[PDB]
């Protein structure tokens, strides 16, 4: 297992900073509006790219969420996304251990419509991780 | 761990000799051999024989070509392993090259056999772009004669084939379960055949040497069970009944 | 920055020697060389090692091939890049090829890790469309033993450059040698440049491991010192007296 | 529209010499030019070499391969553009093509440089079918040596680079920008990194031609600024403050 | 066929081991809230690929199904997966003579998003086999 | 950081020229029908095609975006961007520096049906920069 | 730029002949069972093909539709659209110099379903243009 | 185009065998529980795939639709292909003529589902004409 081990050590990463945000761990969230802009840490794929003749060598995706309320715009998005939270992750030696190699791959918005409540950007790195 | 069986292939291993001794001698002991690790692709040296002339002047119609095998070439054995210069032994290999004298490496397959060969380095070769790491790229070209994980096998038959007998109670489908069994301590290379002497009034539906024998008509016959050796065979007594 | 482990390929860097010593003496600095940028991509020399027969009539069995390698060669690298007319460097290799020198070249990986090869550019080329920055497209073959990363496989370094500071007042043709030594017990590729931050009243002609300054007229100014490939500094001032 | 940044491509254009005198004095000029219009692709000829062996049997090392540069010649150029009969000079192209002469063409990047060879024309080419225009193909043959762009380009340097002084007032990390400039004539090849004398209470952070330095724990820096070329360089004191 | 012993033989292995599961066989499953969380095993595909002159050699996708309470953190099913099977499905002796070979695909999440009663984790698997 | 730089930008080059427009920038817009024809600029994309070997060398698009009121007919459309923006951005000093390269893709268009309230035209341009 | 003319020059080239339909340009159309079978003309696309060195030389598609009302035999279409557009639109010198090349495309159908209020055929070329 | 030429040729073709079904040209059909067994004739596609540097050598697609009431079993269907459309139209002169090269394309079932009031089947050909 490596999952819980990942997203425990980068969590750790972006909390050694100035705080002003909430860290829901895990995927459930359940925000509220008092709890906001937050951050959450999942994984998506895990497949069984082979690649390799002595371990599985599997491959997902580390996605970085941060929430921000309805309509405020994108530029503190981009601030948020892009120094917040970027540089921070650039170099943790925690995971270079954990982990066989990052690569950085989206870096998307969402914003809700249906009674438009929240606002939602996306950093996407895909990991090659051995379990 | 049976080599008697297709193998799934990922989880092989790749060793180099590194002591003075015959690595054809104890190919299995890997005391003597570096493991090198983070294997990206391997691709082995395939073997392949040189056709040799052989038509003659005087003799009967040449019409079809006449060639028989001539001399037989190991072939060169390439591969591909992330690039790890803080490994110990990546330098040696390279150093192997460097140097240029013949050295011998091994193939532990996930199955339970190694395969050895003896060669020198001839192509050494590192590819790099970006959200990749680095390989290393190495060709090698095998020399002499190698030793197949084939020869290392050996040969497990003969002591001839039990049989289960009597079950002459046969009607309403049946299908009696049957085994012939192999005495040479059940490991037994399995190369039998049951048939029987009616076609008709009893048949056998033989599956992993458990034999089912089914009926229709009755009667008296002989159920005969044969290896396909040719010298080793068994029969058994069968009395189907209609109902 | 592990060297142990496997590691992508992003922020790799290319440099061209423009000194005049041995580039292999001191890889990691790099003083004489020249960096050139924007590289767009890069696919590093390939060893290659040709066969050479082995054989003869009054030999054993004649089934195989028994050769070693013979002419070893590093191949050629080829590169391309954005293109650059109006930067300092482009001109250079391009003028390299020009004259067609045999000069050397430094690839530096995100890992500490350097390799250094020498010979002469064999190919330009220019690519060109719409919607897509001009490319120039380099091949350098190279020549003689390649000086590849793994051969030092020993690299010591630490934090600290000891120097003499004050030394200001120097008279009898001024002509002060002031010490510079390395922290970390001189078991490092040491390297270091130091020149007059002014060279109005002082100057300063560093040279085998320690420094002289010869200062021409009166006058208090610092000196600064860079320990090679930019790490470290320190700053020694020197207030050359008249008299 | 400078030499020194990449450019994208599109808006170049192919320019023919149809004067008498030397095209290689200026060719940024259009004078005696012909212009050519709707270019549908263009590939440059490659500049390209020979590897010349310069092999003896009285040589210490044989392994490694030692060759050097030969003869170089600049390849062929092709390219292709709309099929235009009624346009004045694709004639005088087809009627340079059919006495086979040697003429100079320029190509004007927008990028603001150019560059012109020398050559005959060797390929003509028409390709035909609905849906899309129909393509006249050309290609030409270049010949001697050819005038490249990179050599019209000048270099400014030395004289030095300035450095504001004192900016001594640090408090919670500083972050006072420090403005390293040139004094000739401003345009110059930059290269200069600043390194602090200390790493401890004020550490240099470079970034695109400011230097934004930042203090952590009181003390007196000395920080010294370099050039690349290693002659000129300047050393700022800096009174660092914790708090 | 093949499939019945196949999913009896991956059953045999989970319930060999240490249970705290249910293990509603094949597909209908039907749970209500009281049976939480159990696993179940089914086939899809079961194509004809030739790939062998002598032998029909079949292929088809094996999931390991497990059904998890509503908003459940993945750490839960994270560990669950790479703890309680993937371990267990790394070599079972009946699998191997049953079929010709067993090679992993990936794993992902998901759960009923509204009402929100479960939580989903499937293990997909790949099977080569002559009928 | 580039993109509020990246913004700023080119909105100010656009409000360098003549007025007669709203240039709301960013995302939340909210116009209402007091400050009708308003340019609307903003990023997407941003992927890690790393094609460089010494910086990551990102690439996102650009989107400039202009609003007219229902069934206003296209040539005044087509003239609004001629009008307007289209050759604004065959040169300006500003973004050059900032960013590597950036070409054209596409000019398209699209209206408000249900309703009919609204009617807009996108430019597209692709944009290369590294951060 | 050349849109507003591209279409004025054409639909001129279509008035030329006897009238009896209207010249709807663009795209705002509105009918009502009273202005009934006429023509709109209108472009989409508008990328950014290369192709060349020197100029933009851009691309769009161009769209000549014609309606006619509930379920009016194809017939009408067809002949509609051999004489009454293509022969007349096959050489049009006023758009020669105006454009760099054109080809056609395809012809298509498609028609009211609910309650049949209009029956459209659709013409459609491609168009390459100096912008 | 050549269209109603074409499809009165193939009409007329049909409509020489013994006939029992009623002969819809075009598109407009309408049925009712009065006209059934029926057929229907139509093309789609009309394309511009040139190929050819002497004339237009449109490509077009015909259909022939079969109209039978609601759930009668395909079998009738069957029938209905094999005997009155398929073997009547591999050759007749009239379209020989016409066209230049007719392919075989296509033939397959639908039924309605809501309320299953028809059930046609449609056979599909493929033909290259000049215009």
Same mark, same amino acid.
């Given at each position: 297992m490596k999952h819980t081990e990942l997203r425990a050590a980068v969590l750790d990463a972006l909390e050694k900073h100035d705080t002003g945000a909430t860290f829901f761990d895990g995927r459930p969230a359940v925000f509220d509006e008092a709890d906001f802009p937050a951050v959450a840490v999942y994984l998506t794929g895990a497949e069984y790219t082979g690649e390799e003749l002595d371990s599985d060598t599997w491959q997902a995706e580390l996605h970085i969420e941060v929430f921000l309320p309805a309509q405020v715009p994108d530029s503190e998005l981009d601030a948020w996304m892009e120094s917040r939270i970027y540089p921070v992750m650039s170099d943790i030696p925690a995971l270079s251990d954990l982990i066989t190699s990052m690569v950085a791959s989206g870096y998307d918005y969402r914003r809700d419509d249906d009674a438009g409540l929240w606002s939602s950007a996306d950093l996407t790195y895909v990991i090659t991780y051995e379990m | 761990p049976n080599p008697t069986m297709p193998v799934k292939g990922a989880g092989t291993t790749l060793w180099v000799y590194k002591g003075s001794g015959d690595p054809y001698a104890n190919p299995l002991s890997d005391v003597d051999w570096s493991r090198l690790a983070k294997v990206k692709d391997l691709t082995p040296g395939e073997l392949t024989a040189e056709s040799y002339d052989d038509s003659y002047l005087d003799d009967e119609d040449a019409d079809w070509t006449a060639t028989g095998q001539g001399q037989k070439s190991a072939g060169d054995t390439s591969f591909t392993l992330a690039w790890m210069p803080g490994e110990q032994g990546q330098q040696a290999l390279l150093a192997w090259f460097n140097e240029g004298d013949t050295r011998?490496?091994?193939?532990?397959?996930?199955? /339970?056999?190694? *395969?050895?060969?003896?060669?020198?380095?001839?192509?050494?070769?590192?590819?790099?772009?970006?959200?990749?790491?680095?390989?290393?790229? @190495?060709?090698?070209?095998?020399?002499?004669?190698?030793?197949?994980?084939? *020869?290392?096998?050996?040969?497990?038959?003969?002591? /001839?084939?039990?049989?289960?007998?009597?079950?002459?109670?046969?009607?309403?489908?049946?299908?009696?379960?049957?085994?012939?069994?192999?005495?040479?301590? /059940?490991?037994?290379?399995?190369?039998?055949?049951?048939?029987?002497?009616?076609?008709?009034?009893?048949?056998?539906?033989?599956?992993?040497?458990?034999?089912?024998?089914?009926?229709?008509?009755?009667?008296?016959?002989?159920?005969?069970?044969?290896?396909?050796?040719?010298?080793?065979?068994? @029969?058994?007594?069968?009395?189907?009944?209609?109902?």
């Open positions: - | 011998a490496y091994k193939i532990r397959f996930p199955n /339970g056999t190694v *395969d050895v060969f003896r060669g020198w380095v001839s192509s050494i070769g590192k590819a790099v772009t970006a959200k990749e790491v680095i390989t290393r790229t @190495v060709k090698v070209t095998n020399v002499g004669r190698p030793s197949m994980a084939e *020869d290392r096998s050996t040969v497990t038959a003969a002591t /001839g084939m039990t049989v289960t007998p009597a079950s002459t109670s046969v009607v309403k489908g049946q299908s009696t379960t049957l085994t012939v069994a192999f005495q040479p301590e /059940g490991v037994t290379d399995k190369s039998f055949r049951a048939v029987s002497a009616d076609k008709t009034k009893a048949t056998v539906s033989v599956s992993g040497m458990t034999i089912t024998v089914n009926g229709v008509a009755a009667g008296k016959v002989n159920i005969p069970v044969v290896s396909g050796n040719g010298e080793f065979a068994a @029969v058994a007594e069968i009395t189907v009944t209609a109902s």
